Ligand SMILES: [Li+]
C-alpha cells in the first residue's frame with residue numbers, strides 16, 4: 414500500500430464527509446479512507462496495483478466535490 418493526502422473542496426457537513434468516505438471505500442484497491450471535514454482532507458491508503466491517485470481523485474469528483482492530491486504521506 415501507499416498513502417496519499419487528498420485535498421477536497423465543497424464539504425460543509427457531516428453527511429458530506431461521510432459521502433466522500435463511502436465513495437472512497439467503494440473504489441477497488443482502497444484499503445482505508447479517513448476524511449477530515451474541517452481540514453478539507455481525505456487520507457487514503459491504497460494498493461497501487463489496483464488503483465492510482467488519479468482514480469481516487471476522480472471518485473471524489475464523481476461524488477460531487479473537487480479534489481487534488483496534496484501530498485504523498487508514505
Ligand atoms: Li472546509
Ligand SMILES: [Zn+2]
Pocket residue numbers: 424425426427428429430
Ligand atoms: Zn453537506
